[PDB]
Amino acid sequence: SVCAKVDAANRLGDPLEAFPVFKKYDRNGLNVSIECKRVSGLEPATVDWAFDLTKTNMQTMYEQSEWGWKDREKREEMTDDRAWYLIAWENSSVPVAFSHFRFDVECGDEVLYCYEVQLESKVRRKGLGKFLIQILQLMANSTQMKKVMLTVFKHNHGAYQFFREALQFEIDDSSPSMSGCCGEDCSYEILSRRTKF
Numbered sequence: 001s002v003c004a005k006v007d008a009a010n011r012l013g014d015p016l017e018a019f020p021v022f023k024k025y026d027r028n029g030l031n032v033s034i035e036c037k038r039v040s041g042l043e044p045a046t047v048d049w050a051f052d053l054t055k056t057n058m059q060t061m062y063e064q065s066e067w068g069w070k071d072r073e074k075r076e077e078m079t080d081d082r083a084w085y086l087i088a089w090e091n092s093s094v095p096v097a098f099s100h101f102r103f104d105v106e107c108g109d110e111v112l113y114c115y116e117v118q119l120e121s122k123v124r125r126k127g128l129g130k131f132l133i134q135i136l137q138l139m140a141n142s143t144q145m146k147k148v149m150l151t152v153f154k155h156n157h158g159a160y161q162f163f164r165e166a167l168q169f170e171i172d173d174s175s176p177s178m179s180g181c182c183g184e185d186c187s188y189e190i191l192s193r194r195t196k197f
């Protein structure tokens with residue numbers, strides 16, 4: 001059942017274990033190791049770093065959206081027991097990028113939902129962001145999720161092109177239609193990529 005696959009994925013110790021060669025990224029002057037852990041397996045400073053980076057990167061965009069920036073609410077989302085983190089480490093010490101994701105039931109399907117993918121400014125445009133989303137798609141396959149899903153702000157033109165063009169995400173059926181937010185277009189789109197099987 002749908003329940004069963006989601007529960008099984010959340011019982012994994014290390015979902016990235018099935019793809020050992022993807023635990024390193026050494027391209028374009030980057031040399032990082034990549035780990036996948038429950039939020040419970042991170043040091044508090046790492047969780048704080050991830051939140052701080054998201055706020056630095058996203059606060060202004062949230063403020064111009066229908067949601068606003070909810071400081072406490074974002075911290076609680078990112079520290080939830082069900083959260084998984086993909087973290088890229090430089091020099092065995094310094095976190096420089098992460099994705100926070102969950103295995104969940106979304107519009108009735110077993111899906112890997114990506115809440116955040118965030119990179120430090122200094123490591124952007126070197127393929128690492130694409131690599132992290134690739135890894136999410138690998139994990140979706142090995143756990144037999146039906147899609148990887150996420151939400152993007154349309155005003156975030158870079159991230160929008162990143163997902164729609166570079167990664168060929170499509171607009172999900174759950175994305176609110178035109179005139180869908182209080183009689184007007186929503187500032188965001190829900191995007192997805194189906195797993196192939």
Ligand SMILES: CC(=O)SCCNC(=O)CCNC(=O)[C@H](O)C(C)(C)COP(=O)(O)OP(=O)(O)OC[C@H]1O[C@@H](n2cnc3c(N)ncnc32)[C@H](O)[C@@H]1OP(=O)(O)O
Pocket residue numbers: 057114115116117118119120123124125126127128129130131150151152153156157158159161162163166
């Ligand atoms: C669910 C989410 O979190 S939605 C919000 C996404 N996160 C943010 O906006 C936070 C700040 N930005 C980032 O963290 C990163 O820049 C990301 C995640 C958006 C993209 O990761 P990056 O590593 O920088 O991109 P990456 O190097 O992998 O780009 C691959 C391709 O995506 C496209 N792309 C990436 N960034 C851009 C951009 N700013 N403008 C246009 N196209 C882009 C390009 O086609 C690029 O290929 P190219 O360099 O050969 O032209």
